[PDB]
């Protein structure tokens, strides 16, 4: 009958000397408990109580075997650490090695539904074990933070975000994949769109507009197709014809200038609707800088040549004064000047009597350090004429 067989099994859990019997005993106990949980018609009220009484017998005599068996029962049974949740938090600054990974493996499961979490995790110095060179700890400790975002106030999220975005210089694409997975929500639901709210609710959006722009030069393609299809989404970069060209100035960020021209024509060239030669041009631009510079410098004046039909007389002045402002911003902002980009802006400005009066204090210190002096000399002389 069903009163001694289970007792013999849970009693053989206590045979705690040899590795294979009690760990697999805990695992098969998790299987039995899960089958009788989802299959409710058979009772579980004896068995869950029996195995939990065994674990409460376990935890004070020896603790390593307690956390091992609780880890393996929770490997397929969530709700059986509620009775031990203060015990595992009591144990958490006591375990190193693989066992700290084991405790964190436990604590991931019973979060989504738990209140008042960040106090305990802040007490157990979480932001000093989110910054140690193991890999699996650092993957699991970020998968909890993808779960406990929508329970925090922005007073603490700006304390979490300061070492979680130290992970762009990390190896191991799953870890950085998590770190670009949390910022994708912190951008999409904190857009603070002129709402007059807070300085931290506008400051985390600044530091999350930093990393979704520095993450376009990652060393793992196949990942960056995700970030490109994020950034090339309708009403996320405005996709009419010309507004995308204007908005491409907004995501400049001088950590990516070495790739800026190829990225700009890529976002501009994706929205086609010719097939035989456009696709090798997209292919050939992002390999060599000079033909890419030529391609952006022709696309710019192509759209500005079409714009003189539409977009009436005041709007021409508005768009052109904004563009002049942006190019001034570029020359003042750049930190290590890229020559076939500095030449590209001072080559696309010189051919318009609306963008000429640029910044002669900026053109000079730009082209004495970019070593592209004869495009600047021609720009100032085309200015001093007319």
């Amino acid at each position: 009958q069903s009163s001694e067989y289970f007792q013999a099994l849970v009693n053989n859990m206590s045979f705690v000397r040899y590795k294979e019997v009690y760990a697999a005993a805990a695992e098969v106990l998790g299987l039995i408990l899960r089958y009788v949980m989802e299959r409710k018609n058979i009772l579980e009220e004896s068995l869950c109580e029996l195995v939990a009484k065994q674990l409460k017998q376990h935890q004070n005599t020896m603790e390593d075997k307690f956390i091992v068996c609780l880890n393996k029962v929770t490997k397929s049974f969530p709700p059986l650490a509620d009775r031990f949740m203060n015990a595992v938090f009591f144990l958490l600054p006591k375990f190193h090695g693989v066992l700290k990974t084991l405790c964190l493996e436990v604590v991931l499961c019973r979060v989504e539904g738990m209140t008042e979490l960040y106090f305990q995790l802040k007490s157990k110095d979480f932001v000093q074990v989110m910054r140690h060179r193991d890999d699996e700890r650092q993957k699991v400790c970020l998968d909890i933070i993808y779960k406990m975002m929508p329970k925090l106030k922005p007073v603490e999220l700006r304390e979490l975000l300061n070492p979680v975005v130290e992970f762009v210089s990390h190896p191991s694409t799953t870890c950085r994949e998590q770190m670009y997975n949390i910022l994708m929500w912190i951008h999409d639901n904190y857009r603070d769109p002129e709402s007059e709210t807070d300085n931290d609710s506008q400051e985390i959006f600044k530091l999350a507009k930093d990393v979704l722009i520095q993450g376009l030069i990652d060393e793992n393609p196949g990942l960056q197709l995700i970030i490109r299809n994020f950034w090339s989404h309708e009403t996320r970069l405005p996709s009419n014809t010309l507004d995308r060209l204007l908005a491409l100035n907004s995501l400049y960020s001088p950590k990516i200038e070495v790739h800026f021209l190829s990225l700009a024509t890529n976002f501009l060239l994706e929205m086609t609707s010719h097939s035989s030669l456009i696709t090798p041009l997209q292919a050939v631009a992002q390999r060599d800088p000079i033909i890419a510079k030529q391609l952006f410098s022709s696309l710019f004046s192509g759209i500005l040549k079409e714009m003189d039909k539409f977009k009436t007389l005041s709007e021409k002045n508005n768009i052109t004064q904004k563009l002049l402002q942006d190019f001034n911003r570029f020359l003042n902002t750049t930190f290590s000047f890229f020559p076939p980009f500095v030449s590209c802006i001072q080559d696309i400005s010189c051919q318009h009597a609306a963008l000429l009066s640029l910044d002669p204090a900026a053109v000079s210190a730009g082209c004495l350090a970019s070593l592209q002096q004869p495009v600047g000399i021609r720009l100032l002389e085309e200015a001093l004429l007319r």
């Binding site: 004070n60 203060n86 015990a87 009591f90 144990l91 600054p93 006591k94 106090f119 007490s123 157990k124």
Partner: protein, 490 residues
């Protein structure tokens, strides 16, 4: 476990009227609590000097805690009893200390709830060691501290239940707001007055437990049994006198050599031999030779007959007496053979006789194994454990010879007087408490240097006779017992 350590957190309730004099000019409970805490530290700094002892005041005005709550001020952290900790802490004695605590932290606030027990749990969790005892000493006098808000009562009993789960237990040492124990209130929900243990009773003790030898008793040649030879009365004495440099205040780390062979130089273990002189002729030998001339047997116990408990007179003893117990590193069943041997040796009142060689090279020695059956009671008065006991036995030049040839008879006019005298002086023995004057005053004298209060402190010695209370208690029969039959008469 053997290398296990215990832990204690002093949680002080200095909030509302405990900082007041209770409008009583008789005793102040803040200074009473700080005196009790000083007594605990000042005893366990030589009694049990490795446990963990922390001091935490709550209900204060400021705050100091690593989760950063309010009204809660931890003062020190879990560590040894230290002279710095007590010289820091005794600045809160008396009214001068009341004012100094007022200006240093202040007093009075709406004190906490569950959050102070949360601070205690985050104080215990940090320690990476093996905690064996988890106790909290609460010094409070109010007994309905949240008697206007039931949500805080329910959350406090919930958090105390979750502190009871992981293995933390509190014993609130009750201060005397009504003096007598008349607060028969409902504080049963949290707990698992008398202060004399914390006050006086332990000025010179220690705590330890080892086994001293693990030997094996062989009966014929092949029947072996394994016994641990415990020691139970050990003659504690004063610790070794560390050497110290004068100026830099550090140990000296001495070193030792041997030379000057009528040449100087420097020597080794091999160049020199051992020697003796006997009148006229000199012997020389090696160190292995003088260590091997006392070499008989192997370590263990050797069964050499049986005897009942009637020949041994307790005139005959030589050393203290050890205690042999059936350990568990030969077989599961040496306990059973010892239990059978115990039962038979006790019921036929027979005692074993053995030879006993203590360690790897010692001459053998005859012992006698006397059984002992345990005694416990209703309330677990575990006064004896069940097991066997060594008694040593002398050999030859132990027993000397007296002059001894004197035998004079007295007169029986004194026996009833002396029976009345010894019935006058009759007290039922003792169980404890006959402590050591020399070690005791050495403890107090060492207190009076690193604590340097005034002078050598109290030094009563409970081993002196009180002739002033003996004379009146006996009465005026001293003269009649002095000269009933016999005058000295000069």
């Amino acid at each position: 476990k053997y290398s296990g350590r215990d832990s204690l957190i002093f949680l002080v309730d200095a909030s509302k009227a405990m900082f007041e004099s209770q409008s009583e000019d008789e005793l102040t409970p803040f200074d009473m609590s700080i005196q009790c805490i000083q007594s605990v530290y000042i005893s366990k700094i030589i009694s049990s000097d490795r446990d963990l002892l922390a001091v935490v005041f709550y209900g204060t005005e400021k705050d100091k805690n690593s989760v950063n709550f309010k009204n809660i001020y931890v003062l020190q952290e879990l560590d040894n009893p230290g002279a710095k900790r007590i010289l820091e802490l005794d600045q809160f004695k008396g009214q001068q200390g009341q004012k100094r605590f007022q200006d240093m932290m202040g007093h009075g606030s709406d004190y906490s709830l569950s959050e102070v027990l949360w601070v205690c749990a985050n104080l215990f969790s940090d320690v990476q060691f093996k905690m064996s005892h988890k106790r909290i000493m609460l010094f409070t006098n109010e007994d309905n501290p949240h008697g206007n808000d039931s949500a805080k009562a329910s959350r406090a009993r919930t958090k105390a239940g979750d502190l009871r789960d992981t293995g933390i237990f509190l014993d609130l040492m009750h201060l005397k707001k009504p003096g007598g124990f008349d607060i028969s209130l409902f504080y049963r929900d949290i707990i698992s007055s008398k202060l004399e243990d914390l006050l006086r009773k332990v000025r010179a003790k220690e705590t330890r437990k080892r086994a001293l030898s693990r030997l094996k008793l062989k009966l014929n040649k092949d029947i072996v049994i394994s016994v641990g030879i415990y020691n139970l009365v050990q003659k504690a004495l004063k610790p070794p006198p560390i050497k110290l440099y004068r100026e830099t205040n550090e140990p000296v780390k001495t070193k030792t050599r041997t030379f000057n062979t009528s040449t100087g130089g420097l020597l080794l273990p091999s160049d020199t031999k051992r020697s003796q002189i006997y009148g006229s002729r000199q012997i020389i030998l090696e160190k292995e030779e003088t260590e091997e001339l006392k070499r008989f047997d192997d370590p263990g116990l050797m069964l050499m007959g049986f005897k009942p408990l009637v020949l041994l007179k307790k005139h005959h003893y030589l050393r203290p007496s050890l205690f042999v117990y059936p350990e568990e590193s030969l077989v599961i069943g040496s306990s059973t053979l010892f239990s059978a041997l115990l039962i038979k040796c006790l019921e036929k009142e027979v005692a074993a006789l053995c030879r006993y060689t203590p360690r790897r090279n010692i001459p053998p020695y005859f012992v006698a194994l006397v059984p002992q059956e345990e005694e416990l009671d209703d309330q677990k008065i575990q006064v004896t454990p069940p097991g066997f006991q060594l008694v040593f036995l002398p050999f030859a030049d132990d027993k000397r010879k007296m002059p001894f040839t004197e035998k004079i008879m007295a007169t029986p006019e004194q026996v009833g007087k002396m029976k009345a005298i010894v019935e006058k002086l009759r007290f039922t023995y003792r169980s404890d408490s006959f402590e050591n004057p020399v070690l005791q005053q050495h403890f107090r004298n060492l207190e009076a240097l690193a604590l340097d209060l005034m002078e050598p402190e109290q030094a009563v010695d409970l081993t002196l006779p009180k002739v002033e209370a003996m004379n009146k208690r006996l009465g005026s029969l001293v003269d009649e017992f002095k000269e009933l039959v016999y005058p000295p008469d000069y």
